[PDB]
Amino acid sequence: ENSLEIEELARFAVDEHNKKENALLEFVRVVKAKEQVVAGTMYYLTLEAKDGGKKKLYEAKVWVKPWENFKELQEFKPV
C-alpha cells in the first residue's frame, strides 16, 4: 500500500523536522515521492505544509529499515 506508506513517511518527516528544529509546521499532503532501494529504502518526498498558516512546499529525504523499528529524517528544506 505504497501511497499509504508514503503519507505516513511524509507526516513523519514533518514531525521529525518540528521536533528537531523546534518548529510547528502543519502537514497538509504529499505531492511527489520517489522510493529508492539502497541499504534499506530512501524516500525523496515533496510535501505541502503550513508555516504559520501559509502553505509552503518542502522537500524531505527519509531513510527506512523495514526489518526493524527504524526511520530517519536526513534532510528537510523549503522548495
Author numbering: 32 to 110
Show me the paper's own sentences about this structure.
In the present study, we describe a new artificial binding protein scaffold that we have named Adhiron. This scaffold is based on a consensus sequence of plant-derived phytocystatins, which are small (ca. 100 aa) protein inhibitors of cysteine proteases. The overall structure comprises the characteristic cystatin family fold of a four-strand anti-parallel β-sheet core with a central helix.
The Adhiron scaffold was derived from the phytocystatin consensus protein by initial N-terminal truncation to a 92 amino acid sequence which we refer to as the full-length Adhiron scaffold, or Adhiron92. We have determined the crystal structure of the full-length Adhiron92 scaffold by X-ray crystallography. Amino acids 1–10 and 90–92 are not visible in the electron density maps presumably as they are disordered. The Adhiron structure is compact with limited unstructured loops and this is consistent with the very high melting temperature of this consensus protein. The thermal stability of the Adhiron92 and Adhiron81 scaffolds was tested by DSC and both gave identical profiles with a melting temperature of 101°C.
